[PDB]
Amino acid sequence: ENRLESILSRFDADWTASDEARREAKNDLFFSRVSQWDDWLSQYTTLQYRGQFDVVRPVVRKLVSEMRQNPIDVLYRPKDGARPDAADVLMGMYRTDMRHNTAKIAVNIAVREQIEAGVGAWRLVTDYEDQSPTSNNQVIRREPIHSACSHVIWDSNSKLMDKSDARHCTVIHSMSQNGWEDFAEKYDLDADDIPSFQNPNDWVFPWLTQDTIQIAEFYEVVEKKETAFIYQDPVTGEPVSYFKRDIKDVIDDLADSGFIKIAERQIKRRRVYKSIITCTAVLKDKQLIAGEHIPIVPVFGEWGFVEDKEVYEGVVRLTKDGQRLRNMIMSFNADIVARTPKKKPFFWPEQIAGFEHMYDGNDDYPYYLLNRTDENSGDLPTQPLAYYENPEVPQANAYMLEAATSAVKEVATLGVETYVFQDNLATAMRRDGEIYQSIVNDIYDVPRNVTILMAEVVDLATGEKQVLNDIRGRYECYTDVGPSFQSMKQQNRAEILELLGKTPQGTPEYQLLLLQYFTLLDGKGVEMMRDYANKQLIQMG
Amino acid sequence: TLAVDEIIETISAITPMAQKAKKYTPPAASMQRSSNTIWMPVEQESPTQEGWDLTDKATGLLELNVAVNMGEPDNDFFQLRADDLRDETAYRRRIQSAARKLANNVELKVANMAAEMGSLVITSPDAIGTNTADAWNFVADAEEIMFSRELNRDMGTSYFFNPQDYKKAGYDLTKRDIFGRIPEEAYRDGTIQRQVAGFDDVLRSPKLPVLTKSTATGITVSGAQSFKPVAWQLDNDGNKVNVDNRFATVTLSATTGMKRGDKISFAGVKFLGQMAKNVLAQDATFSVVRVVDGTHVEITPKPVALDDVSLSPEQRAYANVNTSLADAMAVNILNVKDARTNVFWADDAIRIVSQPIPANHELFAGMKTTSFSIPDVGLNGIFATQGDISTLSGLCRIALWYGVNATRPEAIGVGLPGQTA
Amino acid sequence: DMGTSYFFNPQDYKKAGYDLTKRDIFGRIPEEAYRDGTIQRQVAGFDDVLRSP
Numbered sequence A: 001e002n003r004l005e006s007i008l009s010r011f012d013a014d015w016t017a018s019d020e021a022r023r024e025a026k027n028d029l030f031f032s033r034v035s036q037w038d039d040w041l042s043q044y045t046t047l048q049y050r051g052q053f054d055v056v057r058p059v060v061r062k063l064v065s066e067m068r069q070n071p072i073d074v075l076y077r078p079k080d081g082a083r084p085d086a087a088d089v090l091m092g093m094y095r096t097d098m099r100h101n102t103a104k105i106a107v108n109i110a111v112r113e114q115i116e117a118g119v120g121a122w123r124l125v126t127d128y129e130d131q132s133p134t135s136n137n138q139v140i141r142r143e144p145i146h147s148a149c150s151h152v153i154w155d156s157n158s159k160l161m162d163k164s165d166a167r168h169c170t171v172i173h174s175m176s177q178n179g180w181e182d183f184a185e186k187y188d189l190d191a192d193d194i195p196s197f198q199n200p201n202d203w204v205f206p207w208l209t210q211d212t213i214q215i216a217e218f219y220e221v222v223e224k225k226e227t228a229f230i231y232q233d234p235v236t237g238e239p240v241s242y243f244k245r246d247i248k249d250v251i252d253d254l255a256d257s258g259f260i261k262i263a264e265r266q267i268k269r270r271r272v273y274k275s276i277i278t279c280t281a282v283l284k285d286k287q288l289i290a291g292e293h294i295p296i297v298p299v300f301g302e303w304g305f306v307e308d309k310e311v312y313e314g315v316v317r318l319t320k321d322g323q324r325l326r327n328m329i330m331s332f333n334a335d336i337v338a339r340t341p342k343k344k345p346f347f348w349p350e351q352i353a354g355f356e357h358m359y360d361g362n363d364d365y366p367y368y369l370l371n372r373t374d375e376n377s378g379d380l381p382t383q384p385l386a387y388y389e390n391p392e393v394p395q396a397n398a399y400m401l402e403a404a405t406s407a408v409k410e411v412a413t414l415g416v417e418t419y420v421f422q423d424n425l426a427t428a429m430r431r432d433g434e435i436y437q438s439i440v441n442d443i444y445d446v447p448r449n450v451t452i453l454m455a456e457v458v459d460l461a462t463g464e465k466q467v468l469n470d471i472r473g474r475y476e477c478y479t480d481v482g483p484s485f486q487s488m489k490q491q492n493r494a495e496i497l498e499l500l501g502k503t504p505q506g507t508p509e510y511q512l513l514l515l516q517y518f519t520l521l522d523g524k525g526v527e528m529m530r531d532y533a534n535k536q537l538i539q540m541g
Numbered sequence B: 001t002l003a004v005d006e007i008i009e010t011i012s013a014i015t016p017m018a019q020k021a022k023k024y025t026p027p028a029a030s031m032q033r034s035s036n037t038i039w040m041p042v043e044q045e046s047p048t049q050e051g052w053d054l055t056d057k058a059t060g061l062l063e064l065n066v067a068v069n070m071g072e073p074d075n076d077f078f079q080l081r082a083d084d085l086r087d088e089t090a091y092r093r094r095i096q097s098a099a100r101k102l103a104n105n106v107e108l109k110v111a112n113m114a115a116e117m118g119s120l121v122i123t124s125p126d127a128i129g130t131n132t133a134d135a136w137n138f139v140a141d142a143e144e145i146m147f148s149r150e151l152n153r154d155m156g157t158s159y160f161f162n163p164q165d166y167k168k169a170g171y172d173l174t175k176r177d178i179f180g181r182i183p184e185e186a187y188r189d190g191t192i193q194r195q196v197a198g199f200d201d202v203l204r205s206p207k208l209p210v211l212t213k214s215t216a217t218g219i220t221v222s223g224a225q226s227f228k229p230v231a232w233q234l235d236n237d238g239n240k241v242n243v244d245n246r247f248a249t250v251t252l253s254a255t256t257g258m259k260r261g262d263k264i265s266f267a268g269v270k271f272l273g274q275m276a277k278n279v280l281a282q283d284a285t286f287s288v289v290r291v292v293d294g295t296h297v298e299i300t301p302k303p304v305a306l307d308d309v310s311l312s313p314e315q316r317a318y319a320n321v322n323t324s325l326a327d328a329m330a331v332n333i334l335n336v337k338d339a340r341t342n343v344f345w346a347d348d349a350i351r352i353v354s355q356p357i358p359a360n361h362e363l364f365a366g367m368k369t370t371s372f373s374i375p376d377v378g379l380n381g382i383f384a385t386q387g388d389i390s391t392l393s394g395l396c397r398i399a400l401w402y403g404v405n406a407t408r409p410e411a412i413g414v415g416l417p418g419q420t421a
Numbered sequence C: 001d002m003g004t005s006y007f008f009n010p011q012d013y014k015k016a017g018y019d020l021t022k023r024d025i026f027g028r029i030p031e032e033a034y035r036d037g038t039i040q041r042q043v044a045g046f047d048d049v050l051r052s053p
Helices: A003-033 A057-068 A088-097 A101-116 A177-187 A253-257 A320-338 A395-411 A419-443 A488-502 A507-518 A525-539 B028-033 B085-089 B091-116 B134-149 B163-174 B182-188 C010-021 C029-035
Strands: A073-078 A119-127 A139-145 A168-175 A213-230 A240-242 A263-277 A282-289 A296-300 A302-305 A310-313 A458-460 A466-468 A477-482 B022-024 B037-041 B065-069 B120-123 B157-161 B202-204 B232-234 B240-242 B248-251 B263-266 B286-290 B296-299 B330-333 B342-346 B350-355 B368-374 B379-388 B393-399 B401-406 B412-416 C005-008 C048-051
Touching: A003 A101, A003 A168, A003 A213, A003 A263, A003 A282, A003 A310, A003 A320, A057 A101, A057 A419, A073 A088, A073 A419, A088 A139, A088 A419, A088 A488, A101 A119, A101 A139, A101 A296, A101 A419, A119 A419, A139 A419, A168 A177, A177 A213, A240 A263, A253 A458, A296 A419, A320 A395, A419 A477, A488 A507, A507 A525, B065 B350, B065 B401, B085 B091, B091 B342, B091 B350, B091 B368, B091 B379, B091 B393, B091 B401, B120 B134, B134 B157, B134 B163, B134 B342, B134 B412, B157 B163, B163 B182, B182 C029, B350 B379, C005 C010, C010 C029
Parallel strands: B022 B350, B120 B412, B157 B202, C005 C048
Antiparallel strands: A073 A477, A119 A139, A119 A296, A168 A213, A213 A240, A213 A263, A263 A282, A302 A310, A458 A466, B037 B065, B157 B342, B232 B240, B248 B296, B263 B286, B263 B330, B286 B296, B342 B412, B350 B401, B368 B379, B379 B393
């Protein structure tokens, strides 16, 4: 019955289910990021040489570079039979609030972890920006998530790569004392009661200090039929607005402005609630957030289900054996070179007695003198001179160094190319576009395009607050994947050039050239060219 | 022999007194020659007269001073064998522990000097858990004695309890059979309150000293002794040299069983109102700083007597005691039983002078010297490394050169509960 | 730094709650110890006070 106990039961089930893959991904990250000698169980014996001879980091660097040269972003396109410009406002807002450094950095981090460990993730959050707001004094920003394998825990009963059918996710936040103070200040929590949770990190590397204040954010999705109010638009048509979104704020201000209620229906929709929890108490209970989806977007590498359990793999999990073997063999051979006697003669002391300054390595003498006689045996025994044999690397060591290097080279080839990984990133971007569109419908001011113009229908409440009024004709555009531009003007320029490339030198070629000059940035010479092109377009009808 | 890198944290120290102590950093180039001493004036006090015709009664001017100096470095010299794995493993954590222990030493020194040079003494014949609101009685007695002596408290005040008496005060609060704000806070958390009885900072300190009972019995003053506030005096060569205003040497019948930090009071001698020179109802209390010879001591407040006749009027204007020493008066001890000390002071009573160690100079080749900020306390030291092969090792030394100084020993105090027997 | 815990046996927990409830006053803490059996989650500075069966 206890809410905390139910949440914790879900969390333990998911934790146990993901135990194997999470630990493997953490090991992969450690291998490719800190040290390949994951030998954290040490011994007090005399120190032994342990070198690192990487042959997997160049491949990882090549793959991350290859994915970096091919940026991918969300592209909203109008639905079938919808208005030809149904995605203009949504695409403009997306390019407005995803052009910052945080979005690009989050996607880059997720991609790099997808290559190395096997899974990454990022998050979408809403904030109140009072200086440069996207709409309704708010912005939507994309935040990174580090070590998604151990810090983002999904619903265990989710069999979709993008986790759209996951119905609850728990994110673990770990901080130091100052970070905890800031977290409490930001979420209006108590800074005196230091939280605690399941620590997702291991002290495997000597780190002096490690952050030890943990908390969790538990998002859940609930789908139900709730009330929607059918109104009549004072301009034209009839809108539909959800009862919860105007329950008390403008429930009478709509009528006072001039909306007349017509009908009351029951429409099914998903609501997302966030709770802030620790291992012993629930801090925030069910704070309702924006969107119809969980705001975490995961990116996977090689993802699948073996037998009712998920396995995700990158490029490193299958080279660890050969790389460890190569490091071990090279360490052994370095030991051979260092701690081994050199090639020097074998002497009896009596053979060189009295001449031991002739053999110390100087070159003051033209030859080497020896002794022949002894006073008891008469003459010294005459044996062929012997030398210590030269150090040598065994054929086994050479063969296995070559074989392990060859094996790692052979395994560490993703595909033939990163087409599958970029397609999985495109899947993540489509899911992110879905989530962002839903969040936009929830918190932004989405105007409607009338064929009579671009009309906004909104009103203020008695407390001076403005509550957005959005019709149910909202999912008019779907999500595709295209190149990453910084603004709609850039996207339009790219479209114009793309058309120009395939258009032969007829009249449309002149049209598109004038259009390209029309959509150019401003100096003085380019200003003159754009003025000329605008005048020509106007005069040509 | 499997081993891990997760360290089992075992101790955690808190150093509040060294935080509250203001830190002073005078110029090192001048301090090299001044013999690590720097002098400061003392707020002037003026005499007054009555009447119309006051010919030949014009006074001079007399401005006293105190001196602040410093002691010796505090180091963590240790040696690092380059082959021992157990030395290779623990070196950086040894540096961390060095920083922690250096800070602990600093604040322990602050506490010891504050307890051993605090002139104001607030004793009680019973423990703090005996009656109701007797912890508040202690704190209010400290506040009252400061107010009556008219000492400056503009920068602030502080009262440090030891954990024993902090818990006693908390018990006194929660035994109240009511629960409002103060008792409810003292129940849910141990904290009694942040301000008590006029002090604007009441804390608990885990390393306040325990002041041993003195063995002195039946000690009397040998000869009348009048002490005169002077700013300098002639030496054997005719050179004028300065005088510390915070010491007086008293010749007693026998200084046996008297040690540094013992608290005494002379019978009949009474406090004064400082500025107004109105006698109080409380005996003047002194703290013996040094037991020099076997018949002399050095008490940290100078007993300048108001009724003294050999003082110039500007010197009498500095009187903090109603009557002088009378060749027979009994000096009675005040710490007659072992008891940990609660310590109160005005925040401007103790300072921490600090100096640099220029071992980064080009004179010291072979050594690598860097700066090393001591955490918690606001102090800087040096971290010096020098390798060796006479033993195939390396030497690491973390040095810190500072010195605590009680500039106003009469503004510091000690609370002594259970001073019976 | 990782928190401190106190654990009462049920008998001493009842005696502690009785100590709170016999208090001739009902402000907030005796009222909690009356309506519920709990004394309080934090006592005398300890970060968590529980009852161990």
